[PDB]
Amino acid sequence: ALISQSIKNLKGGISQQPDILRYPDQGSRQVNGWSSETEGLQKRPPLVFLNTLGDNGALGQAPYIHLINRDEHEQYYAVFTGSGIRVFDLSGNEKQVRYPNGSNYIKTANPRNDLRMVTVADYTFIVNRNVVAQKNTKSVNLPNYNPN
Amino acid sequence: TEDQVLWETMPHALVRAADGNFDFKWLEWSPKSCGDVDTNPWPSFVGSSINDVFFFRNRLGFLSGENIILSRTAKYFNFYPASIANLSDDDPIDVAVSTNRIAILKYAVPFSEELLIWSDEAQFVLTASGTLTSKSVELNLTTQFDVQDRARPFGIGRNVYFASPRSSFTSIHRYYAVQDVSSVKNAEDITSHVPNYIPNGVFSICGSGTENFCSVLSHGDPSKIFMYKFLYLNEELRQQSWSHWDFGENVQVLACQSISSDMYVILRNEFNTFLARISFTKNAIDLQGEPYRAFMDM
Amino acid sequence: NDVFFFRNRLGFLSGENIILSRTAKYFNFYPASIANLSDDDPIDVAVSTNRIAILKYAVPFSEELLIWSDEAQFVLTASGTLTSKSVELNLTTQFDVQDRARPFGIGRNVYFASPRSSFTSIHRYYAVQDVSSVKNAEDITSHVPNYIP
Tell whether C95 is within 8 A of chain B (Cβ): yes
Question: Which of A53, A59, A95 minimizes the C-alpha distance to A74?
Answer: A95
Sign of the dihedral through C-alpha B19, B22, B24, B29: positive
CA A148 to chain CA centroid, nearest Å: 59
Question: Which of B194, B198, B217 minimizes the C-alpha distance to B207?
Answer: B217
What region, left, alpha or beta, does residue B86 occupy, with left being phi > 0 and alpha being psi -120 to 50 degrees? left
Question: Which of B16, B9, B69, B81 minimizes the C-alpha distance to B45?
Answer: B69
The β-bridge relationship of strands B273-279 and C10-13 is unpaired
Question: Which of A72, B86, B90 minimizes the C-alpha distance to C45?
Answer: B90
Question: Mutating which of A11, A34, A36, A38 best tests the C interface, going by the most C Cβ atoms within 10 A?
Answer: A38
CA-to-CA dists, residue B50 to A103, B12, B54, B60, B138, angstroms:
18, 12, 11, 13, 21
Range 34-63 of A in CB contact (< 8 A) with C: 37-38
Q: State whether residue B177 is helix, strand or coil.
A: strand
The CB-side HSE value for B276 (13 A sphere, CA atoms) comes to: 23
Q: How far apart are CA C147 and CA C149, in angstroms?
A: 6
Q: Are B213 and B205 in contact (CB under 8 A)?
A: no
Say which of B114, B181, B232 has its CB closest to residue C138: B232
Tell whether C49 is within 8 A of chain A (Cβ): yes
Question: Mutating which of B72, B137, B160, B235 best tests the C interface, going by the most C Cβ atoms within 10 A?
Answer: B235
Query: Phi and psi at residue B207, in whole multiples of 5°?
Result: 160, 170
Q: Are A76 and A68 in contact (CB under 8 A)?
A: yes
Q: Do B278 and A47 touch (CB under 8 A)?
A: yes
Question: Which of A65, A67, A57, A64 minimizes the C-alpha distance to A108?
Answer: A64
Q: How far apart are CA B201 and CA B166, in angstroms?
A: 10
Question: Which of C63, A95, B172 minimizes the C-alpha distance to A87?
Answer: A95
Write the DSSP symbol of residue B209: T
Tell whether C90 is within 8 A of chain A (Cβ): no
Q: Are A40 and A10 in contact (CB under 8 A)?
A: yes
Chain A nearest CA to B181, separation (Å): 31
Q: Do A122 and C15 touch (CB under 8 A)?
A: yes
Q: Do A118 and C142 touch (CB under 8 A)?
A: no
Query: Phi and psi at residue C26, in whole multiples of 5°?
Result: -75, -40
Q: How far apart are CA C94 and CA B214, in angstroms?
A: 14
Q: How far apart are CA C68 and CA A78, in angstroms?
A: 27
CA-to-CA dists, residue C129 to A112, B4, C109, angstroms:
42, 52, 13
Chain B residues in contact with A80 by the CB 8 A cut-off are: none
CA-to-CA dists, residue C21 to C48, C65, C70, angstroms:
20, 16, 24
- Resolution of the entry in angstroms: 3.3
Q: How far apart are CA B183 and CA A23, in angstroms?
A: 33
Long-range CB pairs of C76-83, under 8 A, 24+ apart, other chains included = C76/C6, C76/C18, C76/C45, C79/B128, C79/B130, C79/B131, C79/B132, C80/B130, C80/B131, C81/C39, C82/C7, C83/C6, C83/C7, C83/C9, C83/C20, C83/C23, C83/C43
Tell whether C79 is within 8 A of chain B (Cβ): yes
Chain B nearest CA to A89, separation (Å): 10
Sign of the dihedral through C-alpha B180, B186, B190, B193: negative
Enclosing H/E stretch for A111? helix A111-114
Q: How far apart are CA A81 and CA C63, in angstroms?
A: 48
Question: Which of B82, B68, B62, B124 minimizes the C-alpha distance to B99?
Answer: B124
Sign of the dihedral through C-alpha A132, A138, A141, A143: positive
Q: 3-state DSSP helix/strand/coil percent for chain C, to nearest 5?
A: 0, 30, 70
Question: Mutating which of A42, A69, A76, A117 best tests the C interface, going by the most C Cβ atoms within 10 A?
Answer: A69
Q: How far apart are CA B125 and CA C41, in angstroms?
A: 30
Chain B nearest CA to C145, separation (Å): 10
Q: Do A120 and C15 touch (CB under 8 A)?
A: no
**Elucidated via:** cryo-EM
